[PDB]
């Protein structure tokens, strides 16, 4: 997550003009990185609340 954000922080620092075009790809890699934690929490919920 922060590695996805950190690259944006340096990038806009190194180039403010491109800060608008890189943000969709920070959002993309952020959501598609957090999805694996989402499915891990889904495993956490399925391991217990359906099994006895």
């Amino acid at each position: 997550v922060a590695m996805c954000f950190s690259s944006y922080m340096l990038a806009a620092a190194r180039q403010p003009n491109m800060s608008a075009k890189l943000l969709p790809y920070c959002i993309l890699g952020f959501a598609l990185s957090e999805a694996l934690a989402l499915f891990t929490l889904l495993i956490a919920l399925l391991e217990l609340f359906v099994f006895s």
Binding site: R14, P16, N17, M18
Partner: protein
Amino acid sequence: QDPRKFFPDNGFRFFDGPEDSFGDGNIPAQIILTLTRQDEFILKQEPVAAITIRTNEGEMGVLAGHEYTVQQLAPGILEVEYEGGKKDQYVISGGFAHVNDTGVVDINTVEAVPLEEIDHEKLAKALEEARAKSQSPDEAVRIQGEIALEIFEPLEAALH
């Protein structure tokens, strides 16, 4: 007395440098290059597609709207590529590349000569001259040989 009859103008004002803005729009399609040796330019604000430098950290390349930077130039060759696919090589003697986010290049150098006016044959003798200088144990001639070889070896590999 007279109240300061003279008023010499600040000579810096005669030059018209860029106003490097943070960028509220798009990027240009081609860099605006301006090469300068000691005092006179060989290239003034020419549109160019790409340029490849040799630096101390390594060999770099640049396109339109490259990140804002400034750095040394290793004593070697410099490659340039226009929008027409052709190329132009220049042997250089150190310098400072000044790249901008707007897309602008100001490469201030000491010397800038085309490859066409150089012969490998004359370079050949100067090679072993530099090697003998480096092998001659003397701080006054050793470093001079190391530097002479530092400038011939890029040419030695660029010619071959």
